[PDB]
Amino acid sequence: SMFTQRLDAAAAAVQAHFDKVLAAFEPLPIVEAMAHATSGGKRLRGFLVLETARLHDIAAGEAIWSATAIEALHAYSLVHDDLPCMDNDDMRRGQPTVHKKWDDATAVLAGDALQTLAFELVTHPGASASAEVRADLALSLARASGAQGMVLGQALDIAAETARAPLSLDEITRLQQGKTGALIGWSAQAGARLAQADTAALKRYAQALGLAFQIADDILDVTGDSAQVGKAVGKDASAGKATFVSLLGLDAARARAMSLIDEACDSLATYGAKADTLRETARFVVRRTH
Amino acid sequence: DLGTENLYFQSMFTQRLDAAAAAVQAHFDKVLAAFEPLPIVEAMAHATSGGKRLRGFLVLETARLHDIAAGEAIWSATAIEALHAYSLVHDDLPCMDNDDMRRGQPTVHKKWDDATAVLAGDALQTLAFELVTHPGASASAEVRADLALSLARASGAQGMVLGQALDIAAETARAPLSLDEITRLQQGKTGALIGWSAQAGARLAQADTAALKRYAQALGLAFQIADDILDVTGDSAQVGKAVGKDASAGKATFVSLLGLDAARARAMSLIDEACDSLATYGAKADTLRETARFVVRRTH
Ligand SMILES: C=C(C)CCOP(=O)(O)OP(=O)(O)O
Ligand SMILES: C=C(C)CCOP(=O)(O)OP(=O)(O)O
Ligand SMILES: C=C(C)CCOP(=O)(O)OP(=O)(O)O
Ligand SMILES: C=C(C)CCOP(=O)(O)OP(=O)(O)O
Ligand SMILES: [Ca+2]
Ligand SMILES: [Ca+2]
Ligand SMILES: [Ca+2]
Ligand SMILES: [Ca+2]
Ligand SMILES: [Ca+2]
Ligand SMILES: [Ca+2]
Numbered sequence: 168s169m170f171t172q173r174l175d176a177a178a179a180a181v182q183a184h185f186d187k188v189l190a191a192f193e194p195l196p197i198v199e200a201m202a203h204a205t206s207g208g209k210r211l212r213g214f215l216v217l218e219t220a221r222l223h224d225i226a227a228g229e230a231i232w233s234a235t236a237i238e239a240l241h242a243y244s245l246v247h248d249d250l251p252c253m254d255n256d257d258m259r260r261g262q263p264t265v266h267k268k269w270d271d272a273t274a275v276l277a278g279d280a281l282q283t284l285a286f287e288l289v290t291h292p293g294a295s296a297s298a299e300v301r302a303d304l305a306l307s308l309a310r311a312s313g314a315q316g317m318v319l320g321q322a323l324d325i326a327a328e329t330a331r332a333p334l335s336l337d338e339i340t341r342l343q344q345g346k347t348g349a350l351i352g353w354s355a356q357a358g359a360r361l362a363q364a365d366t367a368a369l370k371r372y373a374q375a376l377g378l379a380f381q382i383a384d385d386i387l388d389v390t391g392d393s394a395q396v397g398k399a400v401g402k403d404a405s406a407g408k409a410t411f412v413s414l415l416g417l418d419a420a421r422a423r424a425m426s427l428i429d430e431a432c433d434s435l436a437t438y439g440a441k442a443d444t445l446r447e448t449a450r451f452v453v454r455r456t457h
Numbered sequence: 458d459l460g461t462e463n464l465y466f467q468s469m470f471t472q473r474l475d476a477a478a479a480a481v482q483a484h485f486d487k488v489l490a491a492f493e494p495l496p497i498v499e500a501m502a503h504a505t506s507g508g509k510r511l512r513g514f515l516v517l518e519t520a521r522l523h524d525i526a527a528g529e530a531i532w533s534a535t536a537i538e539a540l541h542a543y544s545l546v547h548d549d550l551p552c553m554d555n556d557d558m559r560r561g562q563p564t565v566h567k568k569w570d571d572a573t574a575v576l577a578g579d580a581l582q583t584l585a586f587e588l589v590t591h592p593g594a595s596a597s598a599e600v601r602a603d604l605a606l607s608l609a610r611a612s613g614a615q616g617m618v619l620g621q622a623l624d625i626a627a628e629t630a631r632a633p634l635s636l637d638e639i640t641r642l643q644q645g646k647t648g649a650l651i652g653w654s655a656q657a658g659a660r661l662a663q664a665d666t667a668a669l670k671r672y673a674q675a676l677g678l679a680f681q682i683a684d685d686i687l688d689v690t691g692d693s694a695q696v697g698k699a700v701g702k703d704a705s706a707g708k709a710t711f712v713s714l715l716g717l718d719a720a721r722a723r724a725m726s727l728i729d730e731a732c733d734s735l736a737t738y739g740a741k742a743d744t745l746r747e748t749a750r751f752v753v754r755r756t757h
Binding site for chain 1: 497498572575576591603609612614625
């Protein structure tokens, strides 16, 4: 009840911050596309930033910059992933994708500008009184987002598409760690970085959470309803992809995801009960219907 | 032959530009060596190799002007070259300007495919922010954060990508733009990154940026006029990319509006304005004065 309330409030706060910042830009189609691509979503990543910041006694009014930043980065990655030359999706978050509503060029550019906006948001002085902190947030964001992190993941996903054999569990795990793990890792570590505090516990938490999240996303592709998930389902099989469900089967995938909840929760022990919202987030990542 | 010898650029300028191009390429090599050998990474290297390095050079020479070590400045120089490279990879795509050749080589989407181009361009943008925020870029975290903030404002939907979006709107309409409209578009599309490059040395030194900002406003416009002139009169073998593109795409440019002779003249007036903006630096800015002559007189 308290978890659900916090999540709803975080989503509202992130949306309000996007509405502020994007209303400062010129009212051109590319900016309208930026606003379209950043609306909606569960706000898992932003919520992680806000709740890890709360854990470390960082002001919400500062943490919102970093929470909006990671949502802008994540949104960019989806705008490009949905492109015809990529995964070619017509719908995202229950709405047409940017290239559908506008066109491919607008999607390329809107995505590009959203990546840039992520960096503007974390380096804005509001993000932290400490320039050490802002520089560190930006550096770690770039390393999480680029060709050692999320884009590496995207590249491995492409390699797989036409791999001679199907990937092993170890290969799809390394793929997951770039493709989804990196940005979730940045989000969870954010609060510790904001406080210049040790990131080890939250890094461990996120390693487990990110894997559970991906297993859940693979399960939604197989058993979910496009009306509730807001995107096409059955995609993975159509593309012949190894996924956690193809390798493990559904029962064992679900069970592995549940065991990862325990690992994520155990990682937080040093924080005590102040980390309970992060514990419930781990349960959410597996339970969720979308 | 680019006909460079025939132009008699100053010795120090020539030596410094050559050294800067070699230093930037070396830094790309070093940084990219840490990444995995996948097509996207090979495409990142491809897209970053070559070029005149005008923007990286500006960073290195404005840092020199403010007594900032080259070993620090190289980070920011490489950063801007990574950002610029990204912008070209995306611009060259089939859905954008649809170019097969850049810097005398096949473009990324030609040598690999569109997805690889999209992603390599994406990772190069990211790499630009990695490079400027790396602790090697400055001992001051305030400097690094401000370099990254200013780079984001130069690059995003108030700067370079704004410029791109305006350009697309113009091409689609085959729009007759005014001199003021072509100027505003230029300020985003090309001025913003040149401005960041020239202000970089002052920013690295926590010094006043006003002179170098004014220098770059003039330099950037002179550069763009020169680029427009190359489209009309240049040789694809020297320029390394297709020419004649602008008329076919129904793009108003400084040349289509003013004509060649008046565009050239305007570019010459801008050399003088750029040189004038450096008067408060005295002779130490001589390399930056010759750079203004290079931007107009280059053959590529
Ligand atoms: C990384 C992946 C699997 C893309 C979708 O992420 P989410 O399921 O968190 O998407 P939104 O809530 O942002 O729509
Ligand atoms: C970095 C990105 C965009 C990860 C996308 O993974 P998916 O392709 O599984 O995400 P969905 O499209 O299924 O949301
Ligand atoms: C902004 C423009 C006109 C794109 C090409 O820039 P340059 O002519 O500086 O290209 P390279 O030297 O980097 O190839
Ligand atoms: C921001 C960018 C990519 C500037 C492109 O301008 P041009 O389209 O004139 O550059 P060229 O392709 O002619 O080099
Ligand atoms: Ca996808
Ligand atoms: Ca994919
Ligand atoms: Ca999926
Ligand atoms: Ca072009
Ligand atoms: Ca164009
Ligand atoms: Ca041109």
